[PDB]
Amino acid sequence: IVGGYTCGANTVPYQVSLNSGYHFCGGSLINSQWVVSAAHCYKSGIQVRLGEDNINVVEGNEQFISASKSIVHPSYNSNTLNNDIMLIKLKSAASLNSRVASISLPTSCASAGTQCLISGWGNTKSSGTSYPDVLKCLKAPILSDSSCKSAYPGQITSNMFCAGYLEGGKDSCQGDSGGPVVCSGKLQGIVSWGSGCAQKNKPGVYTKVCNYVSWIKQTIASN
Numbered sequence: 001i002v003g004g005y006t007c008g009a010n011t012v013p014y015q016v017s018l019n020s021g022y023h024f025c026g027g028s029l030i031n032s033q034w035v036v037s038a039a040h041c042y043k044s045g046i047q048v049r050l051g052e053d054n055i056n057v058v059e060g061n062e063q064f065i066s067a068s069k070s071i072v073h074p075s076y077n078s079n080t081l082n083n084d085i086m087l088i089k090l091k092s093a094a095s096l097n098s099r100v101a102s103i104s105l106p107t108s109c110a111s112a113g114t115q116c117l118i119s120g121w122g123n124t125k126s127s128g129t130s131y132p133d134v135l136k137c138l139k140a141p142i143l144s145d146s147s148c149k150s151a152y153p154g155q156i157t158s159n160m161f162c163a164g165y166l167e168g169g170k171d172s173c174q175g176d177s178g179g180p181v182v183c184s185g186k187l188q189g190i191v192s193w194g195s196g197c198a199q200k201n202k203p204g205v206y207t208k209v210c211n212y213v214s215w216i217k218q219t220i221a222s223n
């Protein structure tokens with residue numbers, strides 16, 4: 001997260017870190033057994049880390065749980081990042097508490113101008129590299145689809161939306177992928193991609209979760 005603020009420990013209790021020896025992507029807890037992340041974060045050997053603030057220090061509220069199965073969206077395209085969503089099942093159910101909590105799925109999509117909370121452990125620099133140990137947060141509005149497509153001609157599908165600031169300076173970044181965009185109490189987005197980070201006229205692009213609620217519900221009921 002570039003241009004954000006330190007969230008405060010466990011203030012985003014649905015945020016998870018995906019770990020394969022090191023943090024490599026975010027995710028969001030959607031019930032005690034299931035996490036939703038970005039398909040481009042897929043790999044084998046995932047450990048889900050819940051209850052985290054400082055990802056380099058054991059602070060006493062963590063749960064570490066191996067994935068038992070991953071399900072990438074059937075229509076995910078790795079060239080274009082269309083349908084950049086996957087589901088991860090936990091080998092054992094998380095113990096839900098004030099620091100380890102699920103986030104509700106949308107029942108409707110959100111509108112341009114609505115303010116959202118975006119979070120993660122990704123790079124904090126728009127030029128260069130600095131990785132934080134504690135969770136970072138950013139408040140940012142959904143942008144109109146026309147401004148999104150104007151920024152990224154030929155690249156935006158109906159399964160994507162832009163959020164952020166066209167002037168630059170405030171954005172998600174490398175290592176935030178897979179993590180949450182929460183608007184009015186609902187998981188509306190997954191951190192997916194952008195051209196650089198926090199650059200002028202290059203806002204963040206997010207998977208449009210509201211298009212996937214039926215697939216999520218049916219997939220988790222059958223697995």
Ligand SMILES: CC(C)(C)NC(=O)NC1CCN(C(=O)[C@H](Cc2cccc(C(=N)N)c2)NS(=O)(=O)c2cccc(-c3ccc(CO)c(F)c3)c2)CC1
Nearest residue numbers: 040079080081155172173174192193194195196197204205
């Ligand atoms: C290795 C594997 C095959 C799994 N792919 C993978 O890991 N991809 C991730 C995809 C997501 N990535 C990025 O977009 C990165 C960092 C980043 C991450 C999240 C949000 C933001 C932001 N600014 N909010 C920025 N930005 S980047 O360095 O410019 C870069 C490097 C390579 C590729 C594309 C890119 C751009 C556009 C499209 C779609 O048209 C695209 F498909 C890719 C951008 C990391 C890299």
Ligand SMILES: [Ca+2]
Nearest residue numbers: 054057058059
């Ligand atoms: Ca920790």
